[PDB]
């Protein structure tokens, strides 16, 4: 019921300085001039019409036969000449439609019109705007790019190779005759994992992306967590072949619990279905599944096997240079200071992750804005460290 959405927005995110200057201003002037010129062009094309031809042949033949009163009802089935449609209050009409009949947009399960009186289909509402039962492609092909995260070059190269084995050079292992949807099993500290999302946006620069986080311990009798994600990556194969990011759920939803039977069914259903979808012998598709987690230990033996689920990748903590890069990225939007106090905040630091970096960068701005409002608050030099302590790392009685 959903194929694509009109992407006529996100006007050129590449505003080079992203700070108020003559270059950025001139870029915005060119942008607004382009908008003005496009509006003027379309308006002149539509107003200075190429030709006046009667009622555009609309009111003459099709509009009148469509008629004034109408009612909306779903279209159920299709026959060679007639169409079998399930209109409102459970009505069913098998009528052939010849006025404003767009078969491609008609489709089963779509809203069509009924002209009353002699009830026959006379049009379709392709908008409809109610495909809301299970919605996971709403966030598809996220705009985040490689440059958003730095200092993770090894992991970026590894994931890029693992997901550019398809798309790029598919004939490679087409001739090798394997077509491996191995996916990638991502490790990493709990202090990250949205960093795993960030390294997934690198692939998300190509095709769409689906997310299943936490889901549930599928108590549902039908199960169908992994089975519905299977239907959805079938939908992704219908679309651009999308990835499936199941960070955390690959860990809890697929937990290597030593218990065998009498255990939440997922162990019966979920792991087996995960393996069935992860084996390329059952389902085709350039879909690559990214099973991320922060608990490598709970890797189930089925998930452990590189035989079906290959391309194990470990996300380590950032190094000194990686910390420098990530802090540069996060403070670049905020013009931290003119003294560029960069290395003092990280030289003695250990076990600081991307979430903490973002949090401390945000809290530095918050504390400056609180009362120290001084643009590049001169206080920032040490207040970045002040809110870099911020306690909150960990607290558990004394026990020591």
């Amino acid at each position: 019921k959903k194929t694509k959405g009109p992407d006529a927005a996100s006007k050129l995110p590449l505003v080079t300085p992203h700070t108020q200057c003559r270059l950025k201003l001139l870029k915005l002037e060119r942008i607004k001039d382009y908008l003005l010129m496009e509006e003027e062009f379309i308006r002149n094309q539509e107003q200075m019409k190429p030709l006046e031809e009667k009622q555009e042949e609309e009111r003459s033949k099709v509009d009148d036969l469509r008629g004034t009163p109408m009612s909306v009802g779903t279209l159920e089935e299709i026959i060679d000449d007639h169409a079998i449609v399930s209109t409102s209050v459970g009505s069913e009409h098998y009528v052939s439609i010849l006025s404003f009949v767009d078969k491609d947009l008609l489709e089963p399960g779509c809203s069509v019109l009924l002209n009353h009186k002699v009830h026959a289909v006379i049009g379709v509402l392709m908008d409809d705007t109610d495909p809301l039962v299970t919605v996971m492609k709403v966030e598809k092909a996220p705009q985040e790019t490689y440059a958003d995260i730095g200092g993770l070059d090894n992991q970026i190269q590894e994931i890029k190779e693992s997901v550019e084995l398809p798309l790029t050079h598919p004939e490679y292992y087409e001739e090798m005759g394997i077509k491996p949807p191995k996916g990638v099993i991502l490790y990493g500290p709990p202090g990250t994992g949205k960093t795993l999302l960030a390294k997934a946006v690198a692939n998300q620069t190509s095709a769409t992306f689906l997310r299943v986080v936490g889901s549930e311990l599928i108590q549902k009798y039908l199960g169908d967590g992994p089975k519905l994600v299977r239907e959805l990556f079938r939908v992704a194969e219908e679309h651009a072949p999308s990835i499936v990011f199941i960070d955390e759920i690959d860990a809890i939803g697929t937990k290597r619990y030593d218990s065998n039977s009498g255990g939440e069914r997922e162990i019966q259903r979920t792991m087996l279905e995960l393996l069935n979808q992860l084996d390329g012998f059952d389902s085709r598709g350039d879909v690559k599944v990214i099973m991320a987690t922060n608990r490598i230990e709970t890797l189930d033996p089925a998930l452990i096997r590189p035989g079906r689920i290959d391309r194990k990748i470990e996300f380590p903590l950032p190094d000194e240079k990686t910390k420098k890069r990530i802090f540069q990225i996060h403070t670049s939007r905020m013009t931290l200071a003119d003294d560029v106090t960069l290395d003092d905040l990280i030289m003695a630091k250990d076990d600081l992750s991307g979430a903490d970096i973002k949090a401390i960068c945000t809290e530095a701005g918050l504390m400056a804005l609180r009362e120290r409002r001084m643009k590049v608050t001169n206080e920032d030099f040490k207040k970045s460290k002040e809110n870099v302590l911020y306690k909150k790392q960990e607290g558990t009685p004394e026990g020591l």
Partner: protein
């Protein structure tokens, strides 16, 4: 008896900012490179032949 009709379908260009700066430069270059017969004489002083529709 005369319509005095015009079909234009003409809309003015909406050039606004840098097109208009160029228009300012265009200004810089462009700077150098029936009453006597209508007051008194309404046609009411005419002569008409014997056959003439007059109330």
């Amino acid at each position: 008896e005369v319509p005095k009709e015009k079909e234009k379908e003409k809309v003015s260009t909406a050039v606004l900012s840098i097109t208009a700066k160029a228009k300012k430069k265009e200004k810089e270059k462009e700077k150098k490179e029936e009453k006597e017969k209508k007051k008194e004489p309404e046609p009411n002083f005419q002569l008409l032949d014997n056959p003439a529709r007059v109330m």
